[PDB]
Design a binder for this molecule. Structure first.
Ligand SMILES: Cc1cc2nc3c(=O)[nH]c(=O)nc-3n(C[C@H](O)[C@H](O)[C@H](O)COP(=O)(O)OP(=O)(O)OC[C@H]3O[C@@H](n4cnc5c(N)ncnc54)[C@H](O)[C@@H]3O)c2cc1C
Ligand SMILES: Cc1cc2nc3c(=O)[nH]c(=O)nc-3n(C[C@H](O)[C@H](O)[C@H](O)COP(=O)(O)OP(=O)(O)OC[C@H]3O[C@@H](n4cnc5c(N)ncnc54)[C@H](O)[C@@H]3O)c2cc1C
Ligand SMILES: Cc1nn(Cc2c(C)noc2C)c(=O)s1
Ligand SMILES: Cc1nn(Cc2c(C)noc2C)c(=O)s1
Ligand SMILES: Cc1nn(Cc2c(C)noc2C)c(=O)s1
Ligand SMILES: [Br-]
Ligand SMILES: [Mg+2]
Ligand SMILES: [Mg+2]
Lengths: 486, 483
């Protein structure tokens, strides 16, 4: 019942911290989660949000959705078929995804049993005191104590949870959590939000919709994918539109009612209406702090609800740390993992290390996908006197043959024009997520535009475009956009 | 007519050199090629081997061949269709490829029309003297003179040509050149060679073969793709086999005769026999120096037939340079292009530059594909006291669902273990050619394994494997493997 480390949440960050502590420093670790395998009622489970209702299932489902493009595109390369026999069996996709996620759930179970002093506890973690975690049967603080855990160090890794706008008929709407388990693919769906989860799911639904189906994505402002490169935001919008997805910008649901047939009558703030079979809210995720009872030990939260941390993932309470989505910064699995590894190398390995939250490669499995690392030009332009933008945007040849002429590949490099240093790389097109990973290493090594253009291309690839840009397309000078320097 | 530079071969390296000399250095430039557009009789043409009968068309045809796998694999993700109603129309593929190649031919035609001081001449270029290129009607040096071009500077850029073994019945065999123009897809095809062209064409033929067809690849040695990472060589063998390609290793054609029905009767050195519709020789490519009459100026060749060059692409004759495959070093379009730029910068820019032929990212568009940059471990292990190998090999999750459970993604990093410097990165699996490009930039920046494993992964990707390897799988210490 006494542990070097107690971790609340057996997710991306929590398991990395847990496993590393146990196996790298022979430490004694307790990991708490509410559920041992994916799905209702708690959705996240052993493995965390990414494994159960996140990156893993989403990617399998986006891969499934990609086959709609492959069938259509194959014809240009001489593939012949009756397009009339083509059906997208959503139920098969969901059962395959479920089997894949369950096997990972079982993978982690074996990990805990096989591993000395690494123990899993089922139930709800909360803080009783500085050095005691209590595991309860429910999220209610009043429920039975399954366990009392003595902790030299406590790690909070409870991640995040979908925010559902408090509108009349929100109970008719789902989140990404329920999207993973729909028994049937919606004919008509409204994905609410302009971020990666809304965009990815619009893609998935668009491929699996029954005949005369329609995917509508709404976003409360003017242009989806805030924080992404502007060229890419406008291009993804076009390419989603080109593939039959209806993008409603400057629109936001005001309420939902059930029609008598069980469909959803959506009324927008603008007064517009839309009938859909599914309303999926993806307007944001919020740190899961409530249920930990942070009032009991005085862990400080931010003006946004995230556990306040320093560079070393330390709370205001010594021995108590927080990593991943609960910190409400970059909500990415590899960041959570990095923070967990760093924390344990600091606290248990006597090798202090801080996660670098700059120059993080990330992706959107939009169709087609985004791969990005480092600063967008608007952000670079406020920090640096002289910023150069290099841009190549063209439909690759195979997509002239495929018939998908709308699939422009976009490659942008943003530099500090004073020394050539690459500040950001932004890709839109097939392969972008794979291309961008080694770009992350390049940025860690402080690569300049001349390091890219002096490297010999791999031909033929989209990636070689990154090694073919020698001349800026335009600049920002003291924040001002212009074709040419003074 | 008088030119600052005459370029023989309007190819990857020749066009880079010509354009750079004309537009960046304001030189007057002549370029010669034997054909204005792709295909028979001379196959390569304006644009070079890559455009006409290489990288460009082959990548399109592999993309086409990849849909066979997308067809089968879609079913695991719930796609449901009439499997018996699906046909691979090779005629449509070839027509789509031809239009794509012709469009490039035409744009090069336009580039010559619209670029002042860059002139294209049609026919066969050779050296009359050290400042005179003669353009003639045919490869025969007694053929009619079309032009005589006075040249301050001459660039040899004629590329390479398929090697055909002097065996009985060679005339009943084709090379990659003819493979691009087969009117119908062969039911039975033997690809001869373990190199990238044989492997890539085996994948193309395998996808478009008519019902009950069969692709056989034969190679003289024990394991295909010599020069590639050994783990990758064994996996690509297994993955080709799993997709119905017969890999005949330690086998080589002794002779070919025609069966009565016009099919090819192949006799292997081992006595073995195989009847096929097509025999594609992909056993090598040799520099195209015969037709250049280099004996007229005394340009030094190797016994191989390549033009010998210093690191600046200089022949033993001043004002005569060679770049690209004719130099028989690295036969890649981007290397030829790099050599052309470096030469012109050197000669016309007084900006002296040599192409680094080390740490060049390359690909094989096998199914699945390879991406590689830098040294394989066996090579590193001879040149370094301590070599670490970081290896990750696993069927990615999507391929458990797709049913292609044979599709292991291999990621291998080879380091100098004394300081962690990455010497080589070798990838097998979907995306590998796209992943390896920015790896080339890493190796230029002398990336260490710690630069890889301290970089935060993009998830979920195959590429993140490169950033998830903290601990060597095994070592070479003074040439010896130690697990
Ligand atoms: C739809 C979707 C798609 C995504 N796609 C990607 C992607 O492609 N790439 C990417 O990098 N990221 C992606 N993410 C984000 C990624 O899932 C998260 O950043 C990551 O899982 C956060 O890790 P963590 O360690 O913060 O917590 P999580 O992995 O969320 O783990 C939290 C765990 O804590 C448990 N828990 C919560 N409260 C308690 C309690 N009181 N007691 C016990 N256990 C508790 C939960 O059951 C859960 O298992 C996606 C997210 C979603 C929702
Ligand atoms: C099937 C195949 C696939 C390939 N795939 C790839 C790949 O994916 N990626 C890659 O990087 N490389 C690839 N290559 C290699 C690439 O094509 C070559 O390395 C590149 O084209 C060589 O460029 P170059 O300038 O040396 O010559 P080339 O591009 O071959 O140009 C030589 C030109 O000279 C002309 N010529 C020859 N003799 C004469 C003469 N006497 N007078 C006038 N003109 C003449 C020819 O008509 C030709 O246009 C492939 C090669 C082949 C055969
Ligand atoms: C720094 C930057 N971040 N990103 C990607 C991203 C991530 C990760 N989460 O939200 C956005 C937007 C950019 O494109 S600039
Ligand atoms: C017709 C259909 N058959 N397929 C398989 C396929 C083909 C053929 N090319 O790309 C894919 C993917 C479908 O997904 S509908
Ligand atoms: C150095 C290395 N070069 N390569 C790729 C390659 C190329 C290009 N031509 O022959 C080989 C083999 C490796 O795999 S190790
Ligand atoms: Br061998
Ligand atoms: Mg245990
Ligand atoms: Mg001209």
């Amino acid at each position: 019942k006494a542990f070097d480390l107690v971790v609340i949440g057996a997710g991306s960050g929590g398991l990395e911290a847990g496993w590393n502590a146990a196996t790298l420093y022979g430490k004694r670790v307790a990991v708490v989660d509410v559920q041992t395998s994916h799905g209702p009622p708690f959705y996240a489970a052993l493995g965390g949000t990414c494994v159960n209702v996140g990156c893993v299932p989403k990617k399998l489902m986006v891969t499934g959705a990609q086959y709609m493009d492959h069938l259509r595109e194959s014809a240009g390369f001489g593939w012949e078929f009756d397009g009339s026999s083509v059906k997208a069996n959503w139920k098969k996709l969901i059962a395959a995804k479920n089997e894949a996620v369950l096997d990972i759930n079982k993978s982690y179970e074996g990990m805990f049993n096989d591993t000395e002093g690494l123990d899993f506890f089922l139930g709800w973690g909360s803080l009783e005191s500085k050095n005691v975690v209590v595991v309860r049967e429910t999220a209610d603080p009043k429920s039975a104590v399954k366990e009392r855990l003595q902790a030299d160090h406590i790690l909070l890794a409870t991640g995040s949870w979908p925010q559902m706008p408090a509108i009349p008929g929100i109970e008719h709407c789902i989140s990404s959590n329920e999207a993973f388990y729909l028994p049937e693919p919606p004919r008509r769906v409204l994905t609410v939000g302009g971020g990666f989860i809304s965009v990815e799911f619009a893609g998935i639904f668009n491929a699996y919709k029954p005949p005369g189906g329609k995917v509508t994505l709404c976003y409360r402002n003017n242009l989806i994918l805030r924080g992404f490169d502007e060229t890419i935001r406008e291009e993804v919008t076009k390419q989603l539109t080109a593939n039959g997805i209806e993008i409603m910008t400057n629109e936001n649901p005001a309420k939902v009612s059930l029609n008598t047939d069980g469909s959803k009558h959506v009324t927008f703030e603008s007064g517009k209406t839309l009938d859909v079979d599914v309303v999926m809210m993806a307007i944001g995720r919020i740190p899961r702090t409530n249920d930990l009872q942070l009032g009991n030990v005085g862990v400080k939260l931010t003006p946004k609800g995230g556990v306040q941390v320093d560079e070393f993932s330390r709370t205001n309470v010594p021995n108590i740390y927080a990593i991943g989505d609960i910190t409400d910064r970059l909500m990415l699995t590899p960041v959570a993992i990095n923070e967990g590894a760093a924390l344990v190398d600091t606290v248990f390995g006597n090798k202090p290390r801080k996660t670098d939250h700059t120059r993080v490669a990330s992706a959107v499995f939009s169709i087609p996908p985004i791969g990005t690392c480092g600063l967008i030009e608007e952000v670079a332009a406020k920090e640096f006197e002289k910023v150069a933008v290099y841009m190549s945007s063209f439909t690759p040849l195979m997509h002239n043959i495929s018939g998908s002429k709308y699939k422009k590949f976009v490659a942008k490099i943003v530099t500090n024009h004073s020394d050539g240093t690459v500040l950001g790389v932004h890709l839109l097109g097939d392969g972008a997520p794979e291309i961008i990973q080694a770009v992350g290493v390049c940025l860690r090594l402080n690569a300049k535009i001349s390091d890219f253009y002096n490297t010999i291309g791999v031909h033929p690839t989209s990636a070689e475009e990154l090694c073919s840009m020698r001349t800026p397309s335009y600049y920002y000078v003291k924040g001002e956009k212009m074709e040419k320097l003074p």
